[PDB]
Amino acid sequence: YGHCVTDSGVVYSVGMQWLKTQGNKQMLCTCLGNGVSCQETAVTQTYGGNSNGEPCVLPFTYNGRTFYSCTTEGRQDGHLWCSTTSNYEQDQKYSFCTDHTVLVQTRGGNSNGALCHFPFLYNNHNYTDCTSEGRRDNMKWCGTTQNYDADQKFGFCPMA
Numbered sequence: 102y103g104h105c106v107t108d109s110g111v112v113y114s115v116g117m118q119w120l121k122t123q124g125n126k127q128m129l130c131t132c133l134g135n136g137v138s139c140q141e142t143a144v145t146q147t148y149g150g151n152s153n154g155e156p157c158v159l160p161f162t163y164n165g166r167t168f169y170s171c172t173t174e175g176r177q178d179g180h181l182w183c184s185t186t187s188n189y190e191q192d193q194k195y196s197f198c199t200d201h202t203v204l205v206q207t208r209g210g211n212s213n214g215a216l217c218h219f220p221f222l223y224n225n226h227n228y229t230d231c232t233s234e235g236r237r238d239n240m241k242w243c244g245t246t247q248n249y250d251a252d253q254k255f256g257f258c259p260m261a
């Protein structure tokens with residue numbers, strides 16, 4: 102009951118996302134009991150902006166850097182934004198996104214290589230970063246869901 106097994110024995114509890122190769126690209130596959138909800142590496146839930154919150158069109162460089170996804174670059178409202186056209190500076194088009202659909206690829210603990218979700222609640226104490234609670238060895242970790250302590254599933258974060 103609950104959770105879903107995939108890959109080669111990697112079961113990810115419901116409401117749990119995890120990156121996986123679906124041919125020749127990365128895909129966002131999350132377990133929800135009723136089945137894994139895979140979603141190609143599509144843009145983020147854009148909104149507002151001078152593009153009707155439509156979809157983005159990256160990679161899109163700005164200020165001198167090449168952004169592959171949404172970014173708060175120059176954003177003073179908090180949310181992020183993404184170019185709504187291959188040639189951003191060209192059509193000066195863009196669109197705001199939500200928490201740049203953050204996606205952490207954690208592994209270890211009790212999530213077995215699970216796409217750590219951020220933010221993540223820990224002991225009714227909301228969190229937003231690979232916290233080292235209970236660990237004394239350089240191995241920052243986070244919750245595989247919006248409520249780690251609520252699902253009892255954690256995972257180690259990347260090297261950086």
Ligand SMILES: *[C@@H]1O[C@H](CO)[C@@H](O)[C@H](O)[C@H]1NC(C)=O
Nearest residue numbers: 221222223224225226227228
């Ligand atoms: C964590 O944040 C969410 C949304 O901000 C809120 O609904 C939830 O109650 C918070 N958790 C705690 C323990 O305050």
